[PDB]
Design an enzyme around this catalytic site. Structure first.
Site, mmCIF file in Angstrom:
data_model
loop_
_atom_site.group_PDB
_atom_site.id
_atom_site.type_symbol
_atom_site.label_atom_id
_atom_site.label_comp_id
_atom_site.label_asym_id
_atom_site.label_seq_id
_atom_site.Cartn_x
_atom_site.Cartn_y
_atom_site.Cartn_z
ATOM 1 N N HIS A 83 0.872 -1.154 0.000
ATOM 2 C CA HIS A 83 0.000 0.000 0.000
ATOM 3 C C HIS A 83 0.906 1.199 0.000
ATOM 4 C CE1 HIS A 83 0.380 -0.733 4.433
ATOM 5 N NE2 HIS A 83 0.215 0.565 4.576
ATOM 6 N N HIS A 85 2.320 4.428 1.827
ATOM 7 C CA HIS A 85 2.562 4.746 3.236
ATOM 8 C C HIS A 85 4.054 4.594 3.389
ATOM 9 C CE1 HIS A 85 -1.450 3.990 5.735
ATOM 10 N NE2 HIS A 85 -1.489 5.114 5.048
ATOM 11 N N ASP A 87 5.911 3.276 5.248
ATOM 12 C CA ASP A 87 6.458 1.999 5.698
ATOM 13 C C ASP A 87 6.394 0.914 4.647
ATOM 14 O OD1 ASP A 87 3.701 1.697 5.831
ATOM 15 O OD2 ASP A 87 3.742 0.447 7.663
ATOM 16 N N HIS A 148 -6.940 -2.004 6.092
ATOM 17 C CA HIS A 148 -6.046 -0.993 6.648
ATOM 18 C C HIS A 148 -6.027 0.255 5.762
ATOM 19 C CE1 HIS A 148 -2.259 0.802 8.044
ATOM 20 N NE2 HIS A 148 -1.914 0.801 6.772
ATOM 21 N N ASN A 179 -3.596 3.714 14.489
ATOM 22 C CA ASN A 179 -3.917 4.798 13.568
ATOM 23 C C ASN A 179 -4.586 4.214 12.335
ATOM 24 O OD1 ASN A 179 -3.705 6.481 11.185
ATOM 25 N ND2 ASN A 179 -2.451 7.896 12.396
HETATM 26 C C1 LIG Z 1 3.357 -4.068 16.555
HETATM 27 C C2 LIG Z 1 3.151 -2.561 16.747
HETATM 28 C C3 LIG Z 1 2.030 -2.058 15.841
HETATM 29 C C4 LIG Z 1 1.777 -0.536 15.884
HETATM 30 C C5 LIG Z 1 2.036 0.092 14.517
HETATM 31 C C6 LIG Z 1 1.475 1.460 14.169
HETATM 32 C C7 LIG Z 1 2.030 1.689 12.756
HETATM 33 S S1 LIG Z 1 3.406 2.611 12.347
HETATM 34 C C8 LIG Z 1 3.359 2.329 10.701
HETATM 35 N N1 LIG Z 1 4.285 2.848 9.740
HETATM 36 N N2 LIG Z 1 2.319 1.539 10.444
HETATM 37 C C9 LIG Z 1 1.566 1.163 11.514
HETATM 38 C C10 LIG Z 1 0.357 0.248 11.258
HETATM 39 O O1 LIG Z 1 -0.557 0.029 12.087
HETATM 40 O O2 LIG Z 1 0.278 -0.306 10.140
HETATM 41 ZN ZN LIG Z 2 -0.200 1.602 6.343
HETATM 42 ZN ZN LIG Z 3 2.007 0.023 8.744
#
Ligand SMILES: CCCCCCc1sc(N)nc1C(=O)O
Ligand SMILES: [Zn+2]
Ligand SMILES: [Zn+2]
Length: 231
Positions: A83, A85, A87, A148, A179
């Site tokens: 996706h 984002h 990350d 998501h 989030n």
């Molecule tokens: C295992 C810890 C989970 C919390 C993560 C919060 C974040 S940060 C980010 N770049 N993505 C997310 C997500 O939910 O996809």
């Molecule tokens: Zn994401």
């Molecule tokens: Zn993520």
């Protein structure tokens, strides 16, 4: 033992063997004054490697390639982001500069552009509507619908019954939705269901963040989403 967030300083990357010729990769990055772990996938593609998602950032992604060359030694030739984002596409420009052909759905590319993120070069055709699957070297991509995010793919590795869920699937540890700005809490429990029906043989399920599980991670998410739709 699977590596946890507190064991990976930011800028390092770990590789974890899930099955013959299938690894996950783990990195850490700050989001909103905390640091979180992030997973992605690596699949042998004959003499090459297919990369699923970046290591969440240019420096993390540079370290990813360096770990791959130290630990595996085959070139990464393609990459798929699941996706838009930071990350999942943060690091695409590093990959490109190393020689990696980067791929995403055209919905994913569109959204990375709107949001200021890096944009993979090539558009993946055949993933426009829920249920769609397309073969991509050693894996099948599959768009189950919003969850998501609205563009978010999962990846299944058939040789090994590994199911990579991306951020659409949570680890049991996780009991809050976190989030969900860009999320469809209404369709999300759907798209899990579409996943469960399509991949009932899944022996290994990997979420976008935290510990790998089994198909129980599906339901575990569903719930967690509901609690956020109800309460
Ligand atoms: C295992 C810890 C989970 C919390 C993560 C919060 C974040 S940060 C980010 N770049 N993505 C997310 C997500 O939910 O996809
Ligand atoms: Zn994401
Ligand atoms: Zn993520």
């Amino acid at each position: 033992e699977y590596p946890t967030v507190s064991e990976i300083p930011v800028g390092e990357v770990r590789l974890y063997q899930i099955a013959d010729g299938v690894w996950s990769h783990i990195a850490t990055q700050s989001f909103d004054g905390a640091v979180y772990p992030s997973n992605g996938l690596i699949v042998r593609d004959g003499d090459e490697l297919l990369l699923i998602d970046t290591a969440w950032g240019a420096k993390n992604t540079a370290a990813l390639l360096a770990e791959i060359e130290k630990q595996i030694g085959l070139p990464v030739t393609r990459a798929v982001s699941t996706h838009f984002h930071d990350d999942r596409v943060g690091g695409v420009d590093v990959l490109r500069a190393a020689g990696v052909a980067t791929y995403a759905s055209p919905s994913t590319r569109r959204l990375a552009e709107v949001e200021g993120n890096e944009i993979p070069t090539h558009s993946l055709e055949g993933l426009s509507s829920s249920g769609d699957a397309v073969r991509f070297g050693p894996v099948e991509l599959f768009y189950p619908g919003a969850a998501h995010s609205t563009d978010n793919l999962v990846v299944y590795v058939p040789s090994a019954s590994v199911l990579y869920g991306g951020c659409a699937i949570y680890e049991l540890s996780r009991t809050s939705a976190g989030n969900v700005a860009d999320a469809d809490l209404a369709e999300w429990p759907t798209s899990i269901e579409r996943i469960q029906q399509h991949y009932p043989e899944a022996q290994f399920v990997i979420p976008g963040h935290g510990l790998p599980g089994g198909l129980d991670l599906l339901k575990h998410t569903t719930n967690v989403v509901k609690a956020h739709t109800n309460r």
